[PDB]
């Protein structure tokens, strides 16, 4: 009745395997004794169904016990005011052992266990580590906490709302501007910051003291000039994915803190080069997790906001804008009706004509004119397809030369 | 519904003995490998190595136990089992290009080979020199011949060609048989007489089979148009254009129903009603398997009748480019498909 769940607990204990491979090992063993010994097939098929399709009453998982023991000590070591500010005993080897064990459980065990024990009592255990991180100064332990937060964001999205609304993104954004020597901590800090901002949820206003415009200039100076200690050159492609994610919850490009960074910078070229290599493929590097509701496309959200003002539009060199128009045009046509993105490329194109002198050089204007007349003459009746046509009319109405026949 | 993968490469041709105890495949090479059915296993017993080229047609005479081969090397060889080994016996086809098909006769006194030389070679035995001399039928034909099947009279011959036609010829050899009895196809049946020539001129004729009665012949084409001519109804043709990839071989399981297979990688069924005068699609036979969804993972090139003859067949065999040979049981498909009906 409950065999398939009581075996997985036995196997994970005495082998250390993950949840997935625990089910594989049993499905293979059973599925092979069933075939070699047909006399046992009725018993085996019940056993397989228990896997495909709960635990006994008092029996509690091993991974659930450990998370009661780990979250309880780390919160006890947080509430130990003496040992934190006035150290006497050694703590780096014990804490490093509980945080390693935690990272192997969140990474391998069943997510629904690791979800409830983190969602328990209104995220009491998550929010402690977020404070212990603020309290701890040792980078050997700040690094393991980041690897643990990155595993908790993959489980649920309610945890992301808990972290982004907390003080974590303000300490990372403060440790990165200050402690630039540690390369791993600077590269993981920029990963977690992109995780928690991935969903587009808003944040307290107080975060913008350390996540505002001076933090963007710091990230642009790294994207453009790089660091000396960055030998492998991972950090520019992480400080790009982070800027794309900060700009997700930020509305009203005129009021945007990031765009004030671009318009203040002397010359951005490497940040613009990288935005187009992402647009050519239509890949959202911020979208690491498969959590609903799926937020918008981070790149187009950015470029829609770049071209929401003419001060930020002039960052693109001449050769790059023409490559941006060749791409946007190619996607508008290659995309099918009923897609969500087609109005984004259209709204993006509408933003280019306003804030740039597109009507003086008119690059790919004939190929564009033929595509908009098609989209208006499309007889589709979905609501989304009516939103596209609604944009095109506004685009042609504002600029008439986009409605004329190609010539 | 078996499936034994003899190899990974194609199987150009196959033939069964009388007992269906042994099978002679060509594993896409110059050799004929004879496998025997040991219980639920398949064991190779012989290998025939005389061809300078690839083999395209094999037939096994059931009574005499004499295998005949045809290959791209413009050769044929009649094999006789002397003791424990097969020994060949030479053939004189007199063709300037390669061969494509071969079929033993019912009475095992002749065979017919279809070639790319725009001919058909009616071969018979000559003990004066131990040769098998051949006579030609190349009056109307204009291109390669792909398939053949013998009438039960041991004289009349059907031939599917790449000229888009399925002609029917009279392979009467005076030296080895007396003049035949008449037939609804015609009385005047001397050597090399075009009795019936189809009308359609679109698509290559891949397969041809006579009916057990001898009064019905069907042919498959690359146009996805199965056909069937009835002599009782003044040689009228009934087509059934399919909505899938073409077929490459057919056979009469009964006097009314057929079974075809080809590039769709499974068999199907076709039903004929002489009252209405048309064909009808009897549905796919093999159930969709629980990308491809069948046993044959590539095309099928040859279909054969093991048990029950063409009069009423209980088991038929499929042989395909996927190095496989699948035996089918007809009644098992009747049961496993309650909708399925075999007329």
């Amino acid at each position: 009745r409950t065999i398939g769940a009581e075996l997985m607990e036995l196997v994970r204990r005495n082998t250390g395997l993950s949840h997935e491979l625990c089910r594989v090992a049993i499905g293979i063993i059973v599925g092979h004794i069933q075939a070699s010994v047909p006399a046992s097939s009725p018993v085996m098929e019940q056993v397989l169904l228990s896997l495909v399709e709960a635990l006994p009453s008092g029996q509690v998982c091993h991974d659930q016990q450990r998370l009661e023991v780990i979250f309880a000590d780390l919160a006890r070591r947080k509430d130990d005011a003496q040992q934190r500010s006035w150290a006497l005993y050694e703590d780096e080897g014990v804490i490093r052992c509980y945080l390693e064990e935690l990272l192997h459980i969140l990474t391998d065990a069943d997510p629904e266990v690791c979800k409830k024990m983190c969602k328990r009592n209104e995220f009491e255990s998550v929010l402690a580590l977020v404070a212990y991180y603020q309290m701890e100064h040792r980078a050997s332990l700040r690094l393991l906490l980041l690897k643990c937060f990155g595993a908790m964001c993959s489980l649920d999205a309610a945890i992301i709302s808990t972290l982004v609304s907390s003080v974590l993104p303000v300490e990372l954004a403060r440790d990165m501007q200050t402690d630039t020597q540690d390369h791993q901590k600077l590269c993981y800090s920029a990963l977690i910051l992109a995780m928690v901002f991935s969903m587009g949820e808003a944040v307290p206003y107080a975060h913008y003291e350390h996540l505002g415009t001076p933090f963007a200039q710091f990230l642009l100076n790294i994207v453009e000039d790089g660091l000396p200690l960055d030998t492998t050159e991972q950090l520019p492609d992480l400080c790009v994915n982070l800027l794309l994610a900060l700009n997700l919850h930020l509305p009203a490009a005129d009021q945007n803190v990031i765009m004030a960074a671009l318009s203040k910078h002397a010359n951005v070229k490497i940040f613009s080069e990288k935005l187009l290599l992402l647009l050519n493929r239509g890949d959202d590097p911020v979208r690491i997790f498969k959590h609903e509701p799926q937020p918008p496309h981070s790149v187009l959200k950015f470029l829609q906001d770049v071209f929401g003002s003419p001060a930020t539009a002039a960052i693109f060199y001449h050769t790059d804008m023409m490559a941006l128009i060749d791409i946007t045009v190619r996607h508008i046509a290659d995309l099918s009706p009923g897609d969500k993105l087609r109005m984004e490329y259209l709204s993006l194109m509408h933003a280019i004509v306003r804030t740039t002198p597109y009507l003086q050089h008119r690059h790919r204007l004939p190929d564009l004119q033929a595509i908009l007349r098609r989209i208006l003459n499309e007889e589709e009746t979905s609501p989304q397809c009516q939103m596209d046509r609604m944009i095109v009319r506004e685009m042609c109405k504002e600029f008439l030369v986009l409605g004329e026949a190609p010539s | 519904m078996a499936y034994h993968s003899f190899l990974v490469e194609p199987i150009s041709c196959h033939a069964w003995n009388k007992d269906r105890t042994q099978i002679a495949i060509c594993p896409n090479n110059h050799e004929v490998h004879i496998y025997e059915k040991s219980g639920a296993k398949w064991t190779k017993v012989h290998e025939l190595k005389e061809h300078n080229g690839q083999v395209t047609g094999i037939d096994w005479a059931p009574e005499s136990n004499r295998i005949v081969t045809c290959g791209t090397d413009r050769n044929a060889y009649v094999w006789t089992l002397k003791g424990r080994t097969w020994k060949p016996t030479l053939v004189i086809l007199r063709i300037n290009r390669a061969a494509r098909c071969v079929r033993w006769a019912p009475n095992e006194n002749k065979f017919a080979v279809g070639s790319g030389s725009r001919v058909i070679s009616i071969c018979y035995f000559e003990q004066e020199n131990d040769w098998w001399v051949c006579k030609h039928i190349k009056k109307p034909i204009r291109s390669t011949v792909l398939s053949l099947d013998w009438h039960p009279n041991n004289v009349l011959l059907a031939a599917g060609s790449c000229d888009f036609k399925c002609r029917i010829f009279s392979a009467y050899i005076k030296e080895v048989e007396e003049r035949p009895a008449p037939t609804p196809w015609g009385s005047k049946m001397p050597f090399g007489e075009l009795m019936f020539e189809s009308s359609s001129s679109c698509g290559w004729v891949h397969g041809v089979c006579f009916s057990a009665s001898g009064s019905r012949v069907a042919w498959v084409s690359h146009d996805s148009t199965v056909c069937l001519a009835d002599a009782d109804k003044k040689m009228a043709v009934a087509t059934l254009a399919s909505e899938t990839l073409p077929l490459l071989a057919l056979t009469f399981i009964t006097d009314n129903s057929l079974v075809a297979a080809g590039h769709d990688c499974f068999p199907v069924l076709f039903t004929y009603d002489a009252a209405a005068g048309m064909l009808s699609f009897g549905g796919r036979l093999d159930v969709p398997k629980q990308g491809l969804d069948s046993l044959h993972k590539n095309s099928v090139s040859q279909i054969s009748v093991l048990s029950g003859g063409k009069a009423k067949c209980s088991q038929f065999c499929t042989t395909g480019m996927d190095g496989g040979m699948s035996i089918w049981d007809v009644k098992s498909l009747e049961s496993a498909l309650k909708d399925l009906k075999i007329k």
């Binding site: - | 001129s201 290559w204 690359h222 146009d223 909505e243």
Partner: protein, 152 residues
């Protein structure tokens, strides 16, 4: 190495003057008088009033397949290709479903001929037609375009 004898005999090609070359057949009865094809006034008068579905069948009823002449074929193509381009995208499934099998195959023949020489927007329509006729006729419809020895 190199040769120093006249090797010009290997240049002339004798295979051109051959007697075994293939010869396909044609309709003798059509060489004298060709099939008139869909008359423009018939279809057009049905297009003025907007009766597309009947101008549709009028164009597929007549088709000069047996004709050896190419102009009447070209005129016939421009007529039907003029008709398919004026359809309403929602009405196409309504029209394709009406046709029998032998009209779907003749349709797909004309479709694969419209792709040869396209106008500005002749092909975005024909790809929609191609989707419907394939949903009805399947791959076997296309095979009767490839195997067809007589063009539309």
């Amino acid at each position: 190495a190199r040769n120093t004898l006249s090797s010009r005999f290997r240049r002339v090609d004798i295979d051109e003057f051959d007697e075994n070359k293939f010869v396909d057949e044609q309709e003798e009865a059509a060489a004298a008088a060709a099939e008139p094809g869909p008359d423009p006034s018939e279809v057009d008068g049905l297009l003025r009033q907007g009766d597309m579905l009947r101008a549709f069948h009028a164009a597929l009823r007549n088709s000069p397949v047996n004709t050896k002449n190419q102009a009447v074929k070209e005129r016939a193509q421009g007529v039907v290709l003029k008709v398919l381009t004026n359809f309403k995208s929602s009405e196409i499934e309504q029209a394709v479903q009406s046709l029998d099998r032998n009209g779907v195959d003749l349709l797909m023949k004309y479709i694969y001929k419209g792709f040869e020489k396209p106008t500005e927007n002749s092909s975005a329509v024909l790809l929609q037609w191609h989707e419907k006729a394939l949903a009805v006729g399947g791959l076997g419809s296309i095979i009767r375009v490839l195997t067809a020895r007589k063009t539309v």
